[PDB]
Design a protein around this ligand. Structure first.
Ligand SMILES: CSCC[C@H](/N=C/c1c(COP(=O)(O)O)cnc(C)c1O)C(=O)O
Ligand SMILES: CSCC[C@H](/N=C/c1c(COP(=O)(O)O)cnc(C)c1O)C(=O)O
Lengths: 303, 303
């Protein structure tokens, strides 16, 4: 394949039939989003948000994009903005992966650091605050903007179907902003009412009423129920334990050469769990958002 | 694309015509080998090496593979040996990228650390010594084994020609083992004598008689002149400065969303340099062996 710009490599990621032991002898399919130029499923979102921002006449040549992110979206966004020569300011909460930040910076963005404890909420508050002091500015707001799920709706979703060798029994996915799950579940359920949708979250997330605290799994986890969920018939909301997610990261890497992040491990943990209360010979599809190489600074592969 | 195992992702890497300013208004094409499952062009060698090892009846189910690597070859070899249930011991000099080491152990290899000052030469001596204490063992020996250049000869080389939109004026490549350069130059020069072959080494490397010292650029650099060089007519040997390599690593990421390792920077450095003693409108092809995300622990993006 011959490419001119890096943006061409966004999407069209492989779908792998994990050569692993699945209960009731069913099959789990994962989309290796880490093969995106920026190394995360977020690359898609980023390009799309900026596109939407342009088409809606809310962004121009000298506009200053400001957005709260945990890092991966910041990367996907910085890549897009970089392509359009758009000044970028990313607001990210203090304790997230060093590499994401270095990468964000490396791609040309300017990071604003909010207190670890304030989480995404503080980052969002801070982004909007700054947006109000910068006249020519646009805040994509990936946690509310509908363009978010719309993004995965026309790219990811169709791509999953195209590779699937059979009817998708269920679709498990991790949720950070929710965008990925929603936008894809939306498309899949609207092509087969049967496809059950399942959201996954780390212990310490609110999606299941649990108490709100900090988790070791990174990338997923919510601090308020995501607005993009009324477009999907949520068949079940699973809360995966930290050790469970990481244990999977370790295994997949040691037994099937799969370098996957925690969010990806949590997804696999969830998908394998759902496999038990599902008909035999079923067909589950899930998403691995990024590589474990992105969390090597956190000793991801340690116990 | 639907895949069964990760090994199916090795190779068929994109060829990018870098959207950058070039001397004499020529063009530089780079093969983004960081898109391999293991994140490096080494994935190729690792597979081929073990493959050759089997066909030559030098490897069996219970054999212990021992190889001196700087990390990448080790990762690719770990993948391949993991695929055949082969025990792996990788001898790597002390000061190479941490991530490479983590990945190597996470993939299942066992690392043996040689002194940083002894370099690859200390790594080789140690490999061979260990190899002689283990009866059923095979040392692929990427620095001497002809399977090395051969591996890229039938994969990488053809791949380049496949996408190249015009005759290749010259092919610039970094050298660590020599393999990649020799292998690809060999094929290319035998498909067009006009195609010039240029090797690239970091300051501190012996190719140009320089004094032998430690360099910041990682992945390339030789401590003896690689034997695979008699198969190619070396048209020029460029020794690239550390700052030069890294300055490119910085630029491509801040201007064209390209996350590249130092080895890929020295490469671009040398390629652009050559564009100045080459006809106008020329066509140069080079190779970016791995991502910058692999040297984040080393502050790759810092000045
Ligand atoms: C915690 S919050 C965060 C958000 C995003 N992410 C995100 C993510 C996910 C989810 O996805 P969504 O669309 O749902 O958000 C997964 N994984 C991973 C790794 C990631 O990073 C960013 O980055 O900004
Ligand atoms: C002494 S040097 C070392 C060798 C290998 N590498 C290698 C490499 C290169 C070169 O390639 P070659 O085939 O020539 O060796 C580049 N880059 C990168 C990143 C890398 O890692 C290993 O790893 O072991």
């Amino acid at each position: 394949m011959l490419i001119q710009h890096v943006q061409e490599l966004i999407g069209h990621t492989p779908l792998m039939a994990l050569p692993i032991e699945v209960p009731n002898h069913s099959h789990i399919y994962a989309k290796l989003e880490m093969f995106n130029p920026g190394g995360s499923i977020a690359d898609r979102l980023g390009a799309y948000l900026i596109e939407d921002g342009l088409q809606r006449g809310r962004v121009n040549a000298k506009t200053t994009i400001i957005e709260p992110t945990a890092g991966n979206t910041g990367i996907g966004l910085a890549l897009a903005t970089q392509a359009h020569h758009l000044r970028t300011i990313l607001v990210v909460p203090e304790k997230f992966s060093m590499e994401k930040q270095v990468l964000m910076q490396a791609l040309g963005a300017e990071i604003v650091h909010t207190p670890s404890e304030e989480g995404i909420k503080g980052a969002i508050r801070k982004a909007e605050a700054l947006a109000a002091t910068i006249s020519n500015s646009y805040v994509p707001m990936q946690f509310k903007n509908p363009a978010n799920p719309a993004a995965y709706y026309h790219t990811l979703a169709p791509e999953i179907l195209a590779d699937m060798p059979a009817p998708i029994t269920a679709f498990v996915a991790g949720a950070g902003s929710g965008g990925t799950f929603a936008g894809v579940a939306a498309y899949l359920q609207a092509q087969d009412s049967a496809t059950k949708a399942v959201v996954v979250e780390p212990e310490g997330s609110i999606l299941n009423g649990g108490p709100a605290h900090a988790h070791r799994t990174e990338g997923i986890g919510v601090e308020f129920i995501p607005p993009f969920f009324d477009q999907v018939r949520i068949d079940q909301t699973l809360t995966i334990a930290d050790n469970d997610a990481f244990a999977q990261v370790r295994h997949l890497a040691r037994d099937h050469g799969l370098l996957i992040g925690s969010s990806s491990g949590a997804a696999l943990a969830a998908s394998l769990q759902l496999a038990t209360n599902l008909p035999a010979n079923s067909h589950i599809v899930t998403i691995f958002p990024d590589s474990s190489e992105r969390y090597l600074s956190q000793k991801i592969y340690t116990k």
